[PDB]
Design a binder for this molecule. Structure first.
Ligand code: EUJ
Ligand code: EUJ
Ligand code: EUJ
Ligand code: A1IV6
Ligand code: D10
Ligand code: D10
Ligand code: D10
Ligand code: D10
Lengths: 460, 460, 460, 460
């Protein structure tokens, strides 16, 4: 048992020296790192092109259909008069009807296909307003049934104008929407030696009046559905994916075998000694847990990627998250190889022994941080753009801790002095106290904890 | 006495072990944290909607009434010619008269109600100029009586033009103002399942000529008065408020009882020993002082909030400050619970022992900081936008200490080299010396103080 | 001797205990701090108003005289076609002639007064071009006499058009300038209860063609000459100045007496002991040297300020620098009072003992910094806007050391990848190595020096 | 042998004391620093003027030839309709033909000279489109031969319109280009007392349609070819260059002699002792290796510079890199002089002993950093502009480590909450974990390493 336990906790070099077993797992892990990184790089390069295609088409749509649109004005684009709104709506519909003769892209119309489109209709122009709305601010009276009624006009694309009779119910209007679909072919794919695929863009233009504040924001959004073109006329992507799957499966099997052997040795040692939990889990190789997790994530992400590349899925986010997290874990696992050398192991052990106190001090920091977040949100939110939501407040405070965007934060409040002197003085005290406390004391204590851990490692 | 003193300074767990008294106060404080945080979250969510409504209405007013206005131009919006000013004023008044037919919002006119409006008048167009003004820069002569005279034209809203004869006294003009009120109903409230309230916006448009510099800034400001609509036709908010008040009152009573018992024990101990002050106040539980302060603040803020939600008050700033500070204090009080565990108490005690020297070094830093503030204000203020006011100078220097906005600060001065070589060289020396001194030495000394405190704690 | 030496190096409290002499100098220094700070605050408040007046007038002039000018476009404002230049020049002159009927300010014309104006002319429109210029890029030939010839047209202001025959020598044009003066009265002074003064603005509009690059930048500059108006009809500022002068003179006399006392005692001690220099200068009170310097600076600045407020001088920069530096020094001198208390003296002595090593390490840092500055200037200057001049390069590197403007610096180079791959790779290596070296090692060594100094102080 | 070894490792002052040999090499190195710095400064000043000339001409070209162009719009400038593209192309050609009468600069036309221009043609207007292109998105069909066909129209400059019949093949268009050359003389050179040289700008305007996304970006680029003008009519630059070459050659010879001395002494010592490598290379003077490298770099760069100033080369980048790196190395070499003084040697030795552990920890950091880079690139790239490329991701993460651009990074993701909740939550976790880990632990460990090195140096 003692000999076996000594072998189990032996370094790979010393294990090779003792039993002469070949280090298959180490080479397998190196090859796994290489192939996983290559797969991720190829996937990212492939996806960036589709992202660019969709974004460029959407920008072109914004320039084509939004009256008076200019780049960088998406957040403030809005109508303020009734004639402005009518002109915007009519311009959008007229551009839809004129698209074949004006657009630099090649687009095909789509008709029918269910709501909001009737059969043979390409564009749906709908206004949504309250079922009954009586508003008399003069008498301070109102009678509203909040049930929403939708009225849609259907426009058929031209073969190569009742929508002009639209009458908006301004006082009870909830919103206006324009819906239409356009088909295009992604020729750019030829640059990557891929077969072009067929895109259908569903375009939704929203004139939003849910605030009833006299300002109606205007926005354009697109959803892209990608298919394989039914008659395209212009293998080393699936093969690499199955290679990755096989590599990860072999790694998983070997790591599971190692973990099982560790568990069996733990049970044997406990039984022998009996003739604590923190000492029982000392037999657990955490690096192998990390490798098993990475293998599972990589296999799942590779299956999802194979499905996506065949156009049988559109869950890009989940697959990307899985593969990216797996790549991060496999690259973090390289620290294990450095731990076998004394000079690198000094630094890694310093971090390891520092980690618990760092976590506890993070717990101590969190409550003060949350109190400051709530106070800033409630007090400064009505006045400061960076304090409107709790997550935004947390982001602003975290940036201030790191010395970013400090002066603009102060200046936004400076722009409201004299108006509310009490609020300005409170903001001064709040910001100064928070930043001073966090930079003079908290970061210093983190430094002190790390320094103490390093000293403990260097002078045992 | 010795047994009672031992019990008094005993931890809650050990107090429970000794006497068995239930820890009512601890559970009460946990529940207090929960309910206070929930109250603050609900209040902030409610207030953000009103803030958004007011801001959107004001933006719509700026787009409706200010000739040639565009987003982001508030700071520089100004007139420079007489015809520009006339066109702006006439456009504002014409838009006021045309509002019902052009505006996307629904607004009602207000008439009379005292100054500056006569009875039956909706819009007041007033010009203020010196009583006697004779200015002859050709002869370098002037005769001015600085008494201000106001001339107001009253415009009645249309029923669904003497203001065009306005003649401005340009050489003696102090300013021009346009005042009018608009009534609207906040329908957006239905999204939160609230009854819509009735807003009256008082709109003031100012063309300011108090600098007499040939540039007249133009601004629009709104004040919102919120009432309950007199005939609206579309309980678990006041109940939670009284629950919060009761919880805080119980906490206050228990904490006051504990403090009174501590004072009595202190008096008994002093009397017995006599048969200092720093040792006499060791009987004071500062956490209970903080809890009592938080309870008082929360009760006051909750009363003010109840009044506000009934439309009986409009002091949002004071109530928000009270509630936010109380929430901050209750969340800071959570540190006490961590103090009962040794590993967290190490960090908290490190901070506690470091605090006095940190405060003394802050005092040492303050005088140097103030000297730099004054010098930079006097020298760089005529040339640098960030140095025009002392508070602005302090904010800029504090941001520089933290590594924010450094390059733009240098570049603003770079943009004036050659013009004033002496000033540019002085700015170079000033900025470089300040930043170098503060980053190489001051922050380092704060780090050293914290590290020494941590070492003292770890090696007693 | 020994008793006198003991007394000389005694603290003010112990000196009072021993001899009982009143601490006149300490109270004098406190009063000096107060009065100097008040003087600086009043001076800055007074000067800011004049700065604002001049800046607003200049902005109004830019909006009045520059064709197509808009705020924020000063840096890029330029002409690119011949008709653009003609239109700009003619617009400027026409606006000059139309000023009385269009301007919101009140201005008077100035005539004569020497070059560039003849007698009775208000506006001078001058074009400067080479004496002989023959340029034939088709044949790659040129014959230029670089002597500059100036041709000026004089325009008389109207009484309440040969300049339209201007013919520019485009191929040999050096520049075009428009010069004119405007008189105005600063009424805004009444806000501060000051008597309005009379301003003369000299306005220079430059169309610059010294690059001969097809792009002619256009700029407007003003110089303000301030006088007292010769017939204005609408003491506690000079009295405070003489009070400040008297306070500083008394402080100077007392400090000089103390320094003479120290020198005499040093001479006596040296003579007695003889019956080194670093030990001989230990008798010097550096705080009194600083106080004497501040007194001299304050007296000089107060004299200059008295002259300025009488309109007898216009050297605002020198006076402001003197007074600001004096205020900085007097506020730094407050550290001496903290030096008398042990807990503050610990921190001050830590800084004092650290300072020499900090200076030596700054010397070590300077050479590496200069090498990086030169390399970045020569390599990145042709491509990076922030690297065009050596001072700009130094400012950029200093900001990078402190963690400011890093990403924009990287992105400016990113915007030129592919064009010059070698330069982009070099910039990557340069920036990464510089920042890593300075953050990982240099700042850490400064921290280590300060920490070692603090440890030496705490454990003697 | 012992005396010789003692002399070899002796300081220059002690070598002078022992043998009396004059310190020629030290004075030579000082003079080398001076002359190299002067050469670099003169070269940079000379090159900046040419850079400015080229950039100003290119800006003028953008304003002249790009329809509706404005400053700061280079990245977003693009066409979106067919008539927009036609107008832009025709405007460019019309401005080319009208240049002599409208331009503020003086330009000469160039004809012939090879592709893409025929003989006697000044402007080439070429459209590139696929050989065969049939795109039917309605039927989801396409037949494309990806061979590119180019059709060019030649425009002869006017003597002091078939291009209007251009018909673009929009559905198969790859791009459109306009090529033309202009000759000009750089008169600005006279300011620096230089003979003006003759520039030929080759101007390429690209309307790019390689994405086929309905948005066609428009760009203008210039390449400058500089010659001596064949008949110009208006020595202490080459002399200084040969002086620099001679100084560097003498330094190289002396340093090589010293290194040969060291090698011979090393061999003699090894032979004697035999009667290791890390001890064998202790005989190598690394400062002399650095000096030899700097001498070689400076000589090569000076030869390249001599060629460039004669207009026999145009490889500015390589010469600038060589000279800048050499200047950086010579300025770094100044540290050697400080190493001879104990107080400076303390700091330098601290850095020296810290360097190995710093490098090892950099190796440890690199793998985690790369994992984060890959994960962020794959996950956030589709949504975040700063994450589109791996180098961009690395730059963003490095800036975040230093506290720069943090809030904008958070806000870009905030602008997409609700759309993809999973991606937003992942971005929150990713950013917070990365920044917290790197600021709390990594930088702290660097500080600890430097502090430990300093303590080891101070307490041997
Ligand atoms: C009649 C009024 C009753 C008010 C009840 C209010 C609601 C309720 O549960 O309060 C719980 C509190 C306990 O209050 P609570 O604060 O939870 O309990 C005290 C704290 O633990 C205190 O420690 P620190 O907080 O660290 O100082 C400790 O020294 C005291 O010991 P001691 O016993 O020797 O004084 C405890 O009594 O106990 C009462 O208030 C009286 C008990 C009931 C007596 C009934 C008499 C009819
Ligand atoms: C006649 C001219 C009078 C000028 C008065 C000016 C206005 C006024 O109150 O000055 C106060 C100063 C005190 O000046 P002051 O600086 O406050 O006092 C000195 C400092 O405390 C000094 O310490 P350090 O500052 O740390 O070096 C100490 O060594 C000297 O001891 P010593 O006595 O052994 O020299 C003190 O005299 O004392 C006079 O100046 C003479 C006293 C009056 C003699 C009257 C003779 C008729
Ligand atoms: C004939 C060629 C002459 C070339 C002269 C070139 C121009 C000139 O002044 O060089 C100065 C150098 C001195 O060169 P320099 O480098 O200044 O001097 C040497 C360094 O101080 C070296 O220390 P490190 O640099 O720290 O390694 C030391 O060990 C050598 O000791 P050593 O004497 O025992 O070898 C010195 O000679 O000395 C010559 O080069 C030969 C002297 C003249 C012999 C004349 C013979 C006719
Ligand atoms: C070339 C140039 O314009 C220029 C500007 C500033 C500085 C230098 C050169 C070299 C020394 C530098 C200094 C800025 C401030 C420092 C970085 C100090 O913190 C230490 C060394 C200093
Ligand atoms: C022997 C146990 C070591 C476990 C290390 C796991 C590291 C995980 C980093 C995310
Ligand atoms: C036993 C006394 C402890 C007092 C701690 C109070 C903390 C207040 C933080 C704002
Ligand atoms: C006793 C000598 C002390 C001198 C201190 C001077 C401080 C000057 C700071 C600018
Ligand atoms: C005696 C060996 C010392 C070598 C120092 C070289 C420094 C190079 C810095 C780039």
């Amino acid at each position: 048992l003692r000999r076996r336990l000594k072998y189990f906790f032996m370094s790979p070099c010393d294990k090779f020296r003792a039993k002469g077993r070949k280090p298959c797992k180490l080479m397998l892990q190196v090859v796994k790192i290489l192939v996983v990184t290559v797969q991720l790089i190829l996937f990212g390069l492939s996806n960036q092109l589709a992202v660019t295609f969709r974004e460029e088409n959407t920008i072109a749509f914004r320039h084509l259909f939004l009256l008076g649109y200019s780049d960088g004005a998406d957040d403030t684009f809005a109508a303020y008069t009734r004639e402005q709104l009518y002109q915007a709506i009519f311009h959008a519909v007229d551009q839809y009807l004129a698209l074949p003769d004006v657009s630099l892209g090649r687009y095909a119309y789509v008709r029918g296909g269910g709501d909001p489109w009737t059969n043979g209709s390409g564009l749906a122009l709908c206004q949504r307003y309250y079922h009954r709305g009586h508003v008399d601010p003069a008498n301070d009276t109102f009678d509203i049934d909040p049930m929403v009624v939708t009225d849609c006009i259907q426009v058929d694309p031209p073969e190569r104008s009742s929508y002009k009779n639209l009458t908006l119910k301004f006082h009870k209007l909830v919103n206006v929407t324009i819906h239409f679909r356009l088909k295009t072919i992604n020729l750019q794919s030829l640059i990557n030696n891929e077969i072009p695929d067929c895109y259908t863009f569903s375009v939704l233009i929203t004139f939003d009046n849910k605030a009833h504040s006299g300002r109606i924001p205007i926005s354009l959004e697109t959803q892209a559905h990608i298919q394989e073109c039914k008659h395209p006329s212009v293998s080393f992507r699936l093969l690499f994916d199955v290679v990755v799957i096989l590599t990860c499966s072999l790694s998983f099997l070997l790591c599971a075998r190692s973990l099982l052997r560790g568990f069996l040795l733990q049970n044997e040692f406990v039984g022998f000694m009996w003739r604590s939990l923190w000492e029982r889990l000392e037999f657990v190789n955490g690096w192998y847990i990390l490798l098993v997790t990475s293998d599972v994530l990589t296999i799942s992400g590779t299956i999802m990627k194979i499905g996506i590349e065949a156009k049988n899925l559109a869950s890009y986010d989940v697959c990307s998250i899985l593969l990216g997290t797996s790549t991060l874990l496999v690259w973090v696992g390289v620290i294990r190889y450095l731990t076998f050398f004394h000079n690198y192991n000094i630094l890694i052990a310093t971090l390891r022994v520092a980690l618990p106190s760092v976590m506890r001090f993070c717990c101590c920091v969190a409550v003060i941080y949350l109190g400051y977040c709530f106070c800033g949100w409630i007090v400064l939110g009505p006045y400061h753009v960076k304090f409107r939501s709790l997550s935004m407040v947390s982001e602003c405070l975290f940036s201030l801790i790191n010395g970013d965007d400090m002066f603009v934060t102060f200046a936004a409040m400076q722009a409201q002095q004299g108006r509310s002197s009490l609020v300005w003085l409170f903001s001064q005290l709040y910001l100064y106290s928070f930043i001073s406390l966090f930079i003079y004391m908290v970061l210093s204590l983190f430094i002190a904890l790390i320094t103490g851990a390093y000293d403990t490692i260097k002078h045992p």
